[PDB]
Structure 1
Amino acid sequence: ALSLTADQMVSALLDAEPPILYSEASMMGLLTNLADRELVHMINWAKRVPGFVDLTLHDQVHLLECAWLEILMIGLVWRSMEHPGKLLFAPNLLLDRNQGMVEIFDMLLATSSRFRMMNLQGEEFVCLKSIILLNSGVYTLEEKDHIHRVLDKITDTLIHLMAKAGLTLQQQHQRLAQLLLILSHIRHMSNKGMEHLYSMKCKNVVPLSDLLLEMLDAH
């Protein structure tokens, strides 16, 4: 991971992208089923994020347990960018606001609008998603140094993409900061979604897969 060029970093992350899946109380079933299937693909994707497989299996488990809902939402926000006012959970599951929980929905919509107004690029998106994976559990020695060294390389990669797009040095640093501050909002949305997920699990209304139940137990 530490010897890849910036262009090589971007191509690796682009190649690792998971596929977009389809869906089939009733709403929750589709959403939980969808999240479960997306998690399985997320694990294969994580194994292709450069530097991730260098970590121990225990550290890999911890990072995915901390990051998985953040990753689901940034993916959701990304594929909803070109549908103002909607969230594209699946190509056949495009939801307007009124179809919601809704507090989470509104925050996801606002993030998509932010991405659209900044004109977030696909190459930038995949860098952001790998940062979420490596950052969201790092604060909870040699292995931590390795994750931080990989994180620095992903920052270099983002800056490289911005310089290649013609941004001045000042615009590069500003746009870098704008992107990373959105990750704080994505953490907030995942925090809120985990709390909702736990309430759902206390109730027996919604069927939750064993993997999801193990994910929820980790929080």
Structure 2
Amino acid sequence: SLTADQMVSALLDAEPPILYSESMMGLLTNLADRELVHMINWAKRVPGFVDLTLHDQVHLLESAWLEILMIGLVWRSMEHPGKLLFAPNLLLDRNQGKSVEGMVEIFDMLLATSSRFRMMNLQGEEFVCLKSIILLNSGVKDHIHRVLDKITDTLIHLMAKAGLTLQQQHQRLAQLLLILSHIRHMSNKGMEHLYVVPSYDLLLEMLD
């Protein structure tokens, strides 16, 4: 029932805080573990999410959690070319990733996504819609699609309010959604590198 402006306001308010770092992999694992709690707090404030069953809420988070960690990292790193801002006290370039096998490949995918965000001048209002789509789309039922349809309407609203023509609205919408396919691919490659997954019980306890 929310309007597009009210949808945007809710998602912006819900944004998780930036956490700080507490052997490089140990710091990153500890950081991701602490970020998960705040992610679940964010998810509960995504309009429509808590109308789902608790079993379905966990399934969506089980499928989306790493994608959400990555798009958050990519957003944070967007104005630091060639570097990944894991935390304000953990800025790493790709040279540091060469120690572990298979790290630099995922590092490079994340950097290229950050460069893409930079070239499209992605705005914060668009970013929080994108993150909400990952949450609802990744594990997907009728309720989920009309929440997804509402987020789509909100993105179209933001682009028209920004002055884009109808054609540019369609084109930018498509461009943003095609990036989500690459984020899923990065998440899959990231899962493989990590093989680690938050248990159903752990996610359930965090929700309630």
TM-score (norm 1): 0.87
Q: 1: distance between equivalents of 2:111 and 2:161?
A: 29
The equivalent of 2:129 in structure 1 is 127
For residue 210 of structure 1, report the CA deviation from its aligned partner.
9.7
SS in 1 for 2:92: strand
CA-CA distance at 1:160 after TM superposition:
0.4
- Post-superposition offset of 1:183: 0.2
Alpha-carbon distance, 1:28 to partner: 0.6
Q: CA deviation at 1:101?
A: 1.2
- Asked if the contact 1:163–1:172 (Cα under 8 Å) also holds between the matched residues in 2, the reply is yes
Q: Deviations over 1:126-148 (max 9, x none)?
A: 0000000000000xxxxx01000
In structure 2, list runs of 5 or more residues that go unmatched: 97-101
Q: Which runs of 5+ in 1 are unaligned?
A: 139-143, 199-204
- The offset of 1:113, in angstroms, is 0.2
Change (3 A) 1:212 1:56: closer
1:214 shift after superposition = 12
Q: Report the secondary structure of 1:53's partner residue.
A: helix
- The question of 1:82 aligning with 2:79 is answered yes
Q: Which runs of 4+ in 1 moved over 4 A?
A: 205-217
Distance 1:206 1:53 in 2: 22
Contact 2:73 2:86 in 1 (8 A): yes
Once the two structures are superposed, residues 23-79 of structure 1 have per-residue CA deviations (whole angstroms, 9 ceiling, x without a partner) of: 02x111011000000001000100000000000000000000000000000000001
How far residue 162 of structure 1 moved from its aligned partner, in angstroms, is 0.4
Q: Deviations over 1:164-203 (max 9, x none)?
A: 00001000100000000000000000001111111xxxxx
Q: Secondary structure at the match of 2:80?
A: coil
Cα distance change, pair 107–120 in 1 and its aligned pair in 2 (3 A): same
Shift of the 208–55 alpha-carbon distance from structure 1 to 2, 3 Å rule, reads closer
In the TM superposition, residue 209 of structure 1 has moved relative to its aligned partner by 13
Q: Distance in 1 between matches of 2:157 and 2:45?
A: 21
Q: Whole-Å Cα distance in 1 between the matches of residues 72 and 173 of structure 2?
A: 19
Structure 1 residues 120 and 7, CA gap change in structure 2 (3 angstroms)? same
After superposition, the Cα gap between the structure-2 partners of 1:95 and 1:211, relative to the gap in structure 1 and judged at 3 Å, is farther
SS of structure 1 residue aligned to 2:52: coil
Check conservation: 1:127, 1:158, Cα contact below 8 A.
yes
Q: CA RMSD in A?
A: 3.3
Kept after mapping to 1: 8 A contact 2:40/2:207: no
Q: Indicate the percent of aligned positions where both proteins have the same amino acid.
A: 99
> Does the 8 A contact of 1:29 with 1:207 survive in 2?
no
CA distance change for structure 1 residues 145 and 212 in 2, over 3 Å: closer, same or farther?
closer
Task: Indicate how the Cα distance of structure 1 residues 151 and 216 shifts in structure 2: closer, same or farther if over 3 A, else same.
Answer: closer
For the structure 1 residues 152 and 80, does the alpha-carbon distance in structure 2 shift closer, same or farther, using more than 3 Å as the test? same
Matches within 5 A, 1:191-202: 191-198=188-195
Distance 1:148 1:207 in 2: 26
Residue number in structure 2 paired with 1:9:
7
Number of residue pairs matched by the alignment = 203
8 A contact 1:194–1:216 mirrored in 2:
no
CA-to-partner distance for each residue in 1:5-30, whole Å, 9 max, x for gaps? 00000000000000000002x11101
Q: Deviations over 1:67-125 (max 9, x none)?
A: 00000000000010111111100000000110191111000000000000000000000
Tell me which of 173, 184, 188 is aligned to 1:187. Answer: 184
